[PDB]
Amino acid sequence: KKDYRKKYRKYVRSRFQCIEDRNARLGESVSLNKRYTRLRLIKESPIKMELLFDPDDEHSEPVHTVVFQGAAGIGKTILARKMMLDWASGTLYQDRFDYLFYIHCREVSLVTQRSLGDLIMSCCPDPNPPIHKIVRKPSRILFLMDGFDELQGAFDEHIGPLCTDWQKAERGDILLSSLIRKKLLPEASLLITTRPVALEKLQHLLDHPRHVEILGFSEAKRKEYFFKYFSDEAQARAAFSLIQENEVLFTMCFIPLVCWIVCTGLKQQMESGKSLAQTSKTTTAVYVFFLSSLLQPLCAHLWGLCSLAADGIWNQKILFEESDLRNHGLQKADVSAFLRMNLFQKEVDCEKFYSFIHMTFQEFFAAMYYLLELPSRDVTVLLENYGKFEKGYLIFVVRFLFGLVNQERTSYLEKKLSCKISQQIRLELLKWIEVKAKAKKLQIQPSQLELFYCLYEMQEEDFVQRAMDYFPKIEINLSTRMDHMVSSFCIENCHRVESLSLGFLHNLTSSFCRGLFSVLSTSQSLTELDLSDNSLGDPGMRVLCETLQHPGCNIRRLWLGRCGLSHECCFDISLVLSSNQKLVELDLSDNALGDFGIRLLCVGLKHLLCNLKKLWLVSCCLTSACCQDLASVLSTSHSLTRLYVGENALGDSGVAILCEKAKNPQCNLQKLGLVNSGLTSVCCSALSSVLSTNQNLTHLYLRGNTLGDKGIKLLCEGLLHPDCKLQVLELDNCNLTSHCCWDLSTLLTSSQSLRKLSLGNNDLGDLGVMMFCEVLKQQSCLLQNLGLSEMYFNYETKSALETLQEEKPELTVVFEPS
């Protein structure tokens, strides 16, 4: 007859019409989900809400879990609400799921015992839905869990009694684990929204999740928001222009919540006949401006509320009863005012409790508590409990505290912050940074990012510059405009930073990094810049190359990784080499800088006053052709001493060119990086001439080649020469056999210059090694690692090797295989 499934879709469609889905909607108006602004979704390329659980391009395996992550206040909930509306309307997943259930984490009781009644409680008023029929069929139901990080009370991931069978009642935390792990109602599809910081407590439940990141609004959508928010286009234009002119506030407003806070304040200024001026620069300033603007016209009850918020955070309470309001002196006065204003809501979805409009607001209020004039009111305790899931990580409580603790304060609630208290806290906050800044560890506690966002908020020179003294090495990751804004601010004020590592995330290949590179080049302490494995295309390298020509750079070491740089960029690299007399080490490996790029690079390398000493051209798609220019550089330049060119196609016909010039008596080559070049015995006579002539050559790296016995014999003849000064010889994957052990024995016996000789996976067997063991006792000069890498020997050889280590202590490393 009447199919509940249809009744449920009607319920969902009609229910989720409001954006907030809570009261105090500026006179209880309808905000309309029709105003939904599209979010930028990136998968780990863009992703849509459609096809989230579908198989991808290979193996054709299904997806059971998709997790949405991002910053707070970015519409994770709103995206879920749009999804529910589109599903109910029959436009989204209309051919995939029979039922869609939404479970908010805020309302979940973690410590109480219940059966899986979530499918009843989250749906229609009808107390008897067909749970035992179609609604229990696996794979036909889609669930969404909103706010994993908002789960209150104790929580654990490693629970024996997981609880399967939806019919049985168990603790709420346990029940959630079983559903997330797909042990309860298996094959069900589940969407989870969470802050990245809480992923560490979720990853154990997910096993193999699909990862989707939610990004903020683009400039195009920022304008759209104002025009949809303000019904009068003239107001939308004024509101948009005002904020657009404020680069910092505009950027922060990329976060939908910040945009909302700002738009609401401007609307109120309009209604009140005010100038609509707004000078906020920090996240704190946005929250302080909004709160004081709304209460100023109330303010008398700020204490009772801040105490409530602090008690709420400490005791893991988000949803409050009338008793909790009364216990803080909040009754029949400010509560009503708070509900009239966009500050608090009374939760009108057929329930009986009160709540803050946002968790960032509750944390903001708690932050204010610690500065006014009641769980503790001790910032030491606040900071110590930062690294905890149960307390909600307290990211904003502390970050707002940083911004709030200042001297440059005015009226509008900012005068209610006690001076002595703020001063005592300021000192504690700086010490906190020192302790965490020195902790180079990966965890939920600050990852050397949050410390900088906190310092950005506390935009004061004395405090900020002192904090920077605890960051001699900075390792950070930038994904948006606000991150670069914070990074540039913080690094600009660093006078004691020696090295910086910058990770770049989908924002790349553009001028977006100019605002940071421009700053780095003016640093008087930065020596090493690490840009490894960042997709910065030629345009990114060009911006860097422009900044690397600044006379005040002081940068001595520049490292690149799998950036995909093209041969074209060698034009700009050469321009840097020709004028930057400070650069010593330049690693251009793992790029597409083919023979042409090298031809151009060599222009800078041969340039007068070019002081580059170490050059890595490893894995640069090079052939033997480039050896003509590289050989010219080594001969021409007095500064090049280290050259690595392996993982290319510089075979015997190529190295012969390098050798012709490398052998020059005036050659300054110290390390010859002929690793994976595919060399054989043919060029070994050329190497012999180099080793016996160039007395500055101390290290050979010949791993990856196929020299054979003939090749090593020819090299030995060179190494046996009186004028050979080679100290380190690496012979691992050189395809040598036991037949050459006689030449290696001769080398060990007669060589005087070698200090390290490492033999790797060669077919020397027991004969070669046993022979060496005896030879090495005959007044040998070899004191370093013998090699023996990836080898298996018999008992007697193993005994001889261990014996050698004990009988001749001057040999530091025999390196037995095990």
Ligand X SMILES: Nc1ncnc2c1ncn2[C@@H]1O[C@H](COP(=O)(O)OP(=O)(O)OP(=O)(O)O)[C@@H](O)[C@H]1O
Question: Would you count residue 397 as binding ligand X (CB under 6 A)?
Answer: no
Nearest to 261 by CA among 361, 346, 365: 361
| Tokens 């290979």 belong to residue | 58
The nearest distance, CB 716 to ligand 7YN, in angstroms, is 49
680 appears as a binding residue in the annotation: no
Return the residue of 64, 76, 567, 713 that touches ligand X, per CB under 6 A.
76
Whether residue 76 is annotated as binding a ligand: the answer is: yes
Size of the residue set binding ligand X (CB under 6 A)? 21
In angstroms, the CA 314 to CA 388 distance is 11
210: β partners: 66
Binding to ligand 7YN in span 554-613, by CB under 6 A: none
Instruction: Output 130 or 196, the one with its CB closest to its own copies.
Output: 130
Residue burial 339-371, b: 16+ Cβ < 10 Å; e: rest: eebbbbbbbeeeeeebbbbbbbbbbbbbbbbbb
Pick the binder of ligand X from 86, 107, 118, 146 (CB under 6 A).
146
Is 655 or 741 the residue whose CB approaches its own copies more closely?
741
Q: How far apart are CA 357 and CA 341, in angstroms?
A: 11
Q: Is 252 in the site for ligand 7YN (CB under 6 A)?
A: yes
Q: How far is the CB of 72 from ligand 7YN (least distance, A)?
A: 4
Residue 784 tokens, joined: 């370093």
Rounded CA-CA distance 655/645 in Å is 10
Residue 482's binding partner out of its own copies, ligand 7YN, ligand X, none, with CB under 5 to 8 Å set by partner kind: ligand 7YN
Nearer to ligand X, 257 or 771 (CB): 257
Instruction: Note whether 716 and 685 are within 8 A (CB).
Output: no
Asked if 37 is part of the footprint of ligand X (rule: CB under 6 A), the reply reads yes
Rounded to an integer, what distance in angstroms lies between the CA atom of residue 52 and that of residue 208?
A: 14
Residue 350 interacts with its own copies (CB under 8 A)?
yes
Residue 2: exposure state from Cβ atoms within 10 A (0-12, 13-18, ≥19) = exposed
Tokens of 59: 């193996």
3-state SS of the chain: helix, strand, coil percent to 5?
45, 10, 45
The angle subtended at Cα 790 by Cα 785 and Cα 791, nearest 5°, is: 90
Count other C-beta atoms under 10 Å from residue 275's C-beta.
6
**Interface of this chain with its own copies, residues 797 to 816, rule: CB under 8 A:** 798
Which of 177, 307, 360, 521 is in the footprint of ligand 7YN by CB under 6 A?
360
578 binds, among ligand 7YN, ligand X, its own copies, none (CB under 5 to 8 A by kind): none
| Residue 286 · residue 258 · CB < 8 Å | yes
Q: Does 75 bind ligand X (CB under 6 A)?
A: yes
In the set 632, 765, 781, 813, which binds its own copies (CB under 8 A)? Answer: 765
- Residue ranges of E strands in 85-125: 99-104, 113-114
Q: Is 719 in the site for ligand X (CB under 6 A)?
A: no
Rounded to a whole number of angstroms, the minimum distance from the CB of residue 158 to its own copies is: 17
Check binding of 124 to its own copies (CB under 8 A). Answer: yes
Contacts by 581-584, CB closer than 8 A, 24 or more apart: 581/609, 581/610, 581/611, 582/553, 582/554, 582/555, 582/556, 582/611, 583/548, 583/555, 583/556, 583/557, 583/558, 583/611, 583/612, 584/556, 584/557, 584/611, 584/612, 584/613, 584/614
Which partner in ligand X, ligand 7YN, its own copies, none is near 19 (CB below 5 to 8 A by kind)?
ligand X
Check binding of 25 to its own copies (CB under 8 A). no
To ligand X, the closest distance from the beta carbon of 138 in angstroms equals 27
Residue of 18, 72, 238, 270 interacting with ligand 7YN (CB under 6 A): 72
For residue 11, state whether it binds its own copies (rule: CB under 8 A). yes
Query: Running DSSP on this structure, what letter comes out for residue 607?
Result: S
Candidates 12, 73, 99, 488: give the one binding ligand X (CB under 6 A). 73
In the complex with its own copies, the residue whose CB is nearer, 393 or 793, is: 793
283 vs 589 by CB, closer to ligand 7YN: 283
Nearest Cα residue to 493 out of 513, 527, 470, 477: 470
180 is in an annotated binding site: no
The residue type of 205 is L
| By CB under 8 A, residue 15 contacts its own copies | yes
Q: Among its own copies, ligand X, ligand 7YN, none, what does residue 395 contact (CB within 5–8 Å per kind)?
A: ligand 7YN
Q: What is the dihedral of CA 72, 75, 80, 85, to 10 degrees?
A: 160
DSSP H or E stretch at residue 517: helix 514-520
* 353 near its own copies, judged by CB under 8 A: no
- What are 67's strand-pairing partners? 192, 211
**Binding of ligand X by 5 (CB under 6 A):** no
Q: Rounded distance, CA 171 to CA 110, Å?
A: 6
**Nearest distance from residue 520's CB to ligand 7YN, in Å?**
19
Binding residues for its own copies (CB under 8 A): 7, 10-11, 14-15, 30, 124-126, 348-350, 761, 763, 765, 790-792, 794-796, 798, 817-818
Binding residues for ligand 7YN (CB under 6 A): 71-73, 195-197, 252, 255, 257-258, 283, 360, 395, 449-450, 479, 482-483
Binding residues for ligand X (CB under 6 A): 19-20, 35-37, 39, 72-73, 75-78, 146-147, 150, 193, 256-257, 260, 358-359
- Residues placed in the known binding site for ATP: 37, 70-78, 358
